[PDB]
Design a protein around this nucleic acid. Structure first.
Ligand SMILES: [Mn+2]
Lengths: 106, 93, 84, 99, 97, 78, 103, 92
DNA sequence: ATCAATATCCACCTGCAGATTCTACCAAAAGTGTATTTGGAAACTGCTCCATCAAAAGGCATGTTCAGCTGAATTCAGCTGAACATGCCTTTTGATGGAGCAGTTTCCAAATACACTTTTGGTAGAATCTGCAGGTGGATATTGAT
DNA sequence: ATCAATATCCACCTGCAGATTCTACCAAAAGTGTATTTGGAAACTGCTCCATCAAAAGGCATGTTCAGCTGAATTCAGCTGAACATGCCTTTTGATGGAGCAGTTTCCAAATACACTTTTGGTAGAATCTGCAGGTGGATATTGAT
């Protein structure tokens, strides 16, 4: 039959859509062979990283549908992801519940 | 007028880490935007090393060293992992 | 239709207040309100300008979301959730 | 009494509140209007995608809230607990938007 | 004997270094520092004498600029002496830490 | 080693910076940010040297990651 | 010379080659290489006329780094365009906080 | 080999100020400058390309870009010298 | 505000070596001549998506008291960090050399680009589903007055 | 130390607007059999780059002193937060009309590919030259005392 390349690497993302968006992207004159794979991979991985951290957020909040907020929460709570998407903003995301201690009563 | 997205693909990766969980349309949105961003940051960074190294072709090697530079901490350690692996699998058979 | 004018005074004071609480501020100085407006106005200008420039370059008459998205990216206010 | 909450008590209650939610605080019609006005004075007779406007609004609502934190962290730095223009201006200078 | 009042030198020192354009840190300990750090990244390395000016020119510019921003914070708190406090506020604002 | 960057030298860097007076603590804290800086710049630079399959760090190597870091430098390569 | 047809000092060809060899787009128009060369020129021109004045103001006749940095951070626009660029051997513009001054 | 923008900055230096010359290190700063600005405009010019499903970078893509990249009157006068140079190269 | 006695900048002058600038020539491009492919401009034109109005309702924005307690002006003083003249050692620096090593070449075997042809996996509808938005109320704090 | 007076919580509810499935076409992966190049893998110069070696000379580290800057405690003029009431205008729902994206078609006017042909732009000597860099002599800027 026919082996979808994404299958050879055993990934979920489309390795071939990745090869194509790469070539016609002008990032370079000629595209390697495992380049489309390796990248689909990092992308798959990072995609399942912010996924899980957010699912839980749905669980923490007693909901089964992941919504923006959860994602925002997921990001701004993991030191590393918070970092990678520093200058990025999530439509509907909200902000982390944080009060400057000095302002609290006593 | 058919226009694409990574929709199916994220979704596949969603039932994988959280079988009994589902994602909202707006969220799926926030998702496609992410993937595309990263996708640009990396290929774009690796695009630079090529020129920098008077190399005509972006191999899976540049991608990596592009990932090193672009990703922080373990995220990148664990990152390169799934990739080298994925490419070591691919080529083999 | 009807002339648009002095609308920056539509960004009510109550609203600015709210916006500031989500920020964390507990006590708001008098003058703040007007200041904010000024700063908000300068924002929108830069962003709208750029965006439209993307409408004017694509020879369209309608400003699309990308148009907006694309520009917010130049100002590094990279936004997610509106067109990949 | 009548039952009055001391000052500041409601302010904290508002912070916790709006920080738990995610709805755009500026009222939509005026924002929109303001958007067309500004853009009016750049290119005459333009059209706006319903989504385009929200995009703008989402981005602004955002900026300001974040500029508001930095501002606040500045008010604290000067023993105060009231944000001011003085505070806002510093923050934007360090930020470089107008150093 | 004649002693100069306090900080009068500070102002006379300030106008000086601002009127000048020479790296201030001492050339050898820096380059020394350079190699040390870089050595925790890769071993038996070599640098270009130039790459080191690059690594000193750069550093120094950041430091001078970081200071300008530290001043504007200390002044802002009614004070007149940059403290470790002033230095973080300025950094958390810029978006470094 | 970092201790090579002497207290007086720091005061000079401070001076040009427009600082009149200086706490005693700064010095330790100043060195801190200084290390972190050089640390991030150099590492990103090395990666370049290394990816380049070379063993010596060129001017560019610095310049390049200097850009990746936002701090862009003129007069050392282009 | 292509560049002469436009009366520019900067090399139009070099640019046309720098574009087709930059992975910028699949094909480059002819107007581009020129337009840019001119735009590149005009700007270096702007930076010099303004640094010249600088040098002449010092009593030197040779443009050094500091002569450039002065011209740059003193022109509101040039400061904007190069806001995130740092010049080696440039220093800063002499500025002292009024609150620090004596009286 | 290993080419540079040197000659060009020097020629333009000798027009605005015949009596003046430049240092080496400064010549270098200037080199970096040209390079950078180039890169910024060619970049924003490439995006305009891809962005518009277009496949060719016209001069229209350089200009418009320079409007987004260059501020205030630094931009207008910039666009001018551009339209100029192009108006002349084309006729004859 | 002056008077004088330190210490300081700061012009004025001025001489040669590290540079700047000017020459004198070779490959590497840049520029032609011809001959090919193409991108995307112009002219329909189908048809969403956007602009405007209406209407009724209630959700806020305004504007006005009132006073709690935050910002700001004082006052006081312990003590930290600038100015110094001292004493000493680590940066300066000046070659000098041998060699680790960026860089050149010269093949070529392996990995890409190509040009078609089947063969799916993805995208854009309708058909079915079902989390969860919006209300409803008791249960708990959490406040603020006595 | 008590109690109202409110605001925050949390689980139960229940129709429906936003997913989740269910289903066909078709643009774009995949499979093949050529037609290039690309980028190392030995082979080897010339650099630049470590490192040793050897003296002064600032430049740094000390240890003395105390001027004046940063903090803590009061005080109070009054600014800004919390209510309340008044009624304006932002929502919400729906409907049209058509301006103007977008999807096709059709093709010149414009950009690309080789094979040569011309000059220019980068090097490494060869010929100047501007400051660096000292060195006084003259207000300048300071600081302490009447
Ligand atoms: Mn108007």
């Amino acid at each position: 039959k026919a082996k979808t390349r994404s299958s050879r690497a055993g990934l979920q993302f489309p390795v071939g859509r990745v090869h194509r968006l790469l070539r016609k992207g002008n990032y370079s004159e000629r595209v390697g062979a495992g380049a489309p794979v390796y990248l689909a991979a990092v992308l798959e991985y990072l995609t399942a990283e912010i996924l899980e951290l957010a699912g839980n957020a749905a669980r923490d909040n007693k909901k089964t549908r992941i919504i923006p907020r959860h994602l925002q929460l997921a990001i701004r709570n993991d030191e590393e992801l918070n970092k990678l998407l520093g200058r990025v903003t999530i439509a509907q995301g909200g902000v982390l519940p944080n009060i400057q201690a000095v302002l609290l009563p006593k | 007028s058919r226009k694409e997205s990574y929709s199916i693909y994220v979704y596949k990766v969603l039932k994988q880490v959280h079988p009994d969980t589902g994602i909202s349309s707006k969220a799926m949105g926030i998702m496609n935007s992410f993937v595309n961003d990263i996708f640009e940051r990396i290929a774009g960074e690796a695009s630079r090393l090529a020129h920098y190294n008077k190399r005509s072709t972006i191999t899976s090697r540049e991608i990596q060293t592009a990932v090193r530079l672009l990703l922080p901490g373990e995220l990148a350690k664990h990152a390169v992992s799934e990739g080298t692996k994925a490419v070591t699998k691919y080529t083999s058979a | 239709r009807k002339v648009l004018r002095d609308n920056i005074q539509g960004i009510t004071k109550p609203a600015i207040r709210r916006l500031a609480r989500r920020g964390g501020v507990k006590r708001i100085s008098g003058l703040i309100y007007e200041e904010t407006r000024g700063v908000l106005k300068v924002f929108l200008e830069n962003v709208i300008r750029d965006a439209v420039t993307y409408t004017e370059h694509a020879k369209r008459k309608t400003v699309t979301a990308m148009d907006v998205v694309y520009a917010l990216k130049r100002q590094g206010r990279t936004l997610y959730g509106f067109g990949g | 009494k009548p039952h009055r909450y001391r000052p500041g008590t409601v302010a904290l209650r508002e912070i916790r509140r709006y920080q738990k939610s995610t709805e755009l605080l500026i009222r939509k019609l005026p924002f929109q209007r303001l958007v067309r006005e500004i853009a009016q004075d750049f290119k005459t007779d333009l059209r706006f995608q319903s989504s385009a406007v929200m995009a703008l609004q989402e981005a602004c609502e955002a900026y300001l809230v974040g500029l508001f934190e930095d501002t606040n962290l500045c008010a604290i730095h000067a023993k105060r607990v009231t944000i001011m223009p003085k505070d806002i201006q510093l923050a934007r200078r360090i930020r470089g938007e107008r150093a």
